């Protein structure tokens, strides 16, 4: 998941688009509205079945709180496309 020579600066953006639970690019990104943290749907829903809190900041969170953060899905798709188009 690396860029052509001289695009090391892209790492910051790549890192922002990765879930803190699984380290993969957001898959069906969900926001926790009370704290603005984001996770893959499956990742966060699995965590909340365990503990009803944000796995980053510890604020109380229940499953009905979660909302889709659709723009992150769009960004993941577009960044993957960009990266592959450049490596070509």
The residue ranges that bind its own copies (CB under 8 A) are 6-7, 9-10, 12-13, 16, 31, 33, 36, 38, 67-72, 74-75, 78-79, 81-82, 85-86
CB closer to its own copies out of 50 and 65: 65
CA distances from 84 to 2, 17, 41, 75 (A): 10, 16, 25, 14
Q: How far is the CB of 79 from its own copies (least distance, A)?
A: 6
Give CA separation, 54 vs 1, 19, 33, 58, in Å: 28, 13, 11, 5
17 scored as a contact of Zn ion (CB under 5 A): no
> Could you say which of its own copies, Zn ion, none residue 28 binds, taking C-beta under 5 to 8 angstroms by partner kind?
none
């Amino acid at each position: 998941s690396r860029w052509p020579p001289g695009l090391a600066v892209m790492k910051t953006i790549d890192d922002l688009l990765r879930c803190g639970i699984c380290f993969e690019y957001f898959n069906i990104a969900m926001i926790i509205p009370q704290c603005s943290h984001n996770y893959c749907s499956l990742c966060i829903r699995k965590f909340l079945s365990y503990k009803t809190q944000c796995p980053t900041c510890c604020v109380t969170v229940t499953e009905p709180d979660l909302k889709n953060n659709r723009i992150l899905d769009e960004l993941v798709k577009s960044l993957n496309f960009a990266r592959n188009h450049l490596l070509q």
